[PDB]
């Protein structure tokens, strides 16, 4: 149950929530869901010069099946 | 290869690079391991800013611990 072993969901500038999902092995998988469209900035405000996006990971579950789950969020910027 | 399903590794405020990790006696023999590009995060100016850090997002995977991508953390709520 991911929270219990990692803070990042809360300390990220693109913070995310975790949704319970049941079924299968593993029986319970936690999906990540960005809290915001914007990213939270150096003050704690929602900044719309960037966006929160899920980082997806293809994990193999159970014959064999590969499905895509959001592992957490990152912040993307138009500037480079 | 993620690199060509998703673009984010490049456009993130905490951009990352990927590393091939091939193991013959292992399925899936190929896993792509992410590694943050910087200690800091890219800011609005496009510079590395050390008021925040790029950190790897770790995941348990059925085949071990894998770095899937990076997010940016601040010391403030």
């Amino acid at each position, epitope marked *: 149950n991911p929270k219990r072993s990692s803070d990042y969901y809360n300390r990220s500038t693109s913070p995310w929530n975790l949704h319970r999902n049941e079924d299968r092995y593993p029986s319970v998988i936690w999906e990540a869901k960005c809290r915001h469209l914007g990213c939270i900035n150096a003050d704690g405000n929602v900044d*719309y010069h960037m966006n929160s996006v899920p980082i997806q990971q293809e994990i193999l579950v159970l014959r064999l099946e590969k499905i895509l789950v959001s592992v957490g969020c990152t912040c*993307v910027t138009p*500037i480079v | 290869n993620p690199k*060509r*399903s*998703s673009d984010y590794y490049n456009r993130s405020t905490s951009p990352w690079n990927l590393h091939r990790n091939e193991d013959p006696e292992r399925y899936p023999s190929v896993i792509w391991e992410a590694k943050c590009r910087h200690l800091g995060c890219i800011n609005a100016d496009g510079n590395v800013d050390y008021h925040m850090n790029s950190v790897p997002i770790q995941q348990e995977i059925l085949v071990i611990l894998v770095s899937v991508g990076c997010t940016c953390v601040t010391p403030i709520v």
Partner: antibody
Framework: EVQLLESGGGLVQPGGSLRLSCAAS????????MSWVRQAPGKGLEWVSAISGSGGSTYYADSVKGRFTISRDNSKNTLYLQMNSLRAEDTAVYYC???????????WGQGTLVTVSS | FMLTQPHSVSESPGKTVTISCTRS????????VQWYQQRPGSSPTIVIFANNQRPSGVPDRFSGSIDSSSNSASLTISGLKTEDEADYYCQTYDPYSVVFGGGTKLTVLG
């Protein structure tokens, strides 16, 4: 090179229904927010709709809210626009566009003509 | 909210012309401003994105700035050329809506 090829435009009656497509190439599709923007002949640009990369967020201009549906098929690099209950003022060249982040479009397609007339 | 720009703007070759874009509500400085060029019969082309960003292929004569206090954005063209004649649109957004300005026609005199 980023390329956006729109199709589906054509003649529909008022009240009628019509679906646009945008085949995308040149870039990593599902990591991009996408929008549709329209232009009546001899008049200005007008934002219609927008969608997030995942397709989880969906946005609409007030003049199309409820009549139009945007969606995307990420496994096909295709963006759609379902247009229902069409009106004469919906007559425009419809452009498909890549976003970067919500609200900052970087690339445009070449457009597809939609004519609403009896 | 709405975005106001002038209908036309006129200047002669080699000089500097500035096209302004005024936001009627919300803070301009909270949302990036884009500029597009459109030549008769053509897709819009990007001139400026995210305030000042110039894509490769666009001359450095083109530049964008923002003025947070006046709640407006401007596009500057220096070293004006005949080939610069076209329609220009600013564009910006809020957490939900995306909005275009009404477009300026750029005329090169003489």
């Amino acid at each position: 090179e980023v390329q956006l090829l729109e199709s589906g435009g054509g003649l529909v009656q008022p009240g009628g229904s019509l679906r646009l497509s945008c085949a995308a190439s040149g870039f990593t599709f599902s990591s991009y927010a996408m929008s549709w923007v329209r232009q009546a002949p001899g008049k200005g640009l007008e934002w219609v709709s927008a969608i997030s990369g995942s397709g989880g967020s969906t946005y609409y201009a007030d003049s199309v809210k409820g009549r139009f549906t945007i969606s995307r098929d990420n496994s096909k690099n295709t963006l759609y626009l379902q247009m229902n209950s069409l009106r004469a003022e919906d007559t425009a060249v419809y452009y498909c566009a890549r976003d970067l982040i919500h609200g900052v479009t970087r690339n445009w397609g070449q457009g597809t003509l939609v004519t609403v007339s009896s | 909210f709405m975005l106001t720009q002038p209908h036309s703007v006129s200047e002669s070759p080699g000089k500097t012309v500035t096209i302004s874009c005024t936001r009627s509500s919300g803070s301009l400085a909270n949302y990036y401003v884009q500029w597009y060029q459109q030549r008769p019969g053509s897709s819009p082309t990007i001139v400026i994105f995210a305030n000042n960003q110039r894509p490769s292929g666009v001359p450095d004569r083109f530049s964008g700035s923002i003025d947070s206090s006046s709640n407006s954005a401007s596009l500057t063209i220096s070293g004006l050329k005949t080939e610069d004649e076209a329609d220009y649109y600013c564009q910006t957004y809020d957490p939900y809506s995306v909005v275009f300005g009404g477009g300026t026609k750029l005329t090169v005199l003489g």
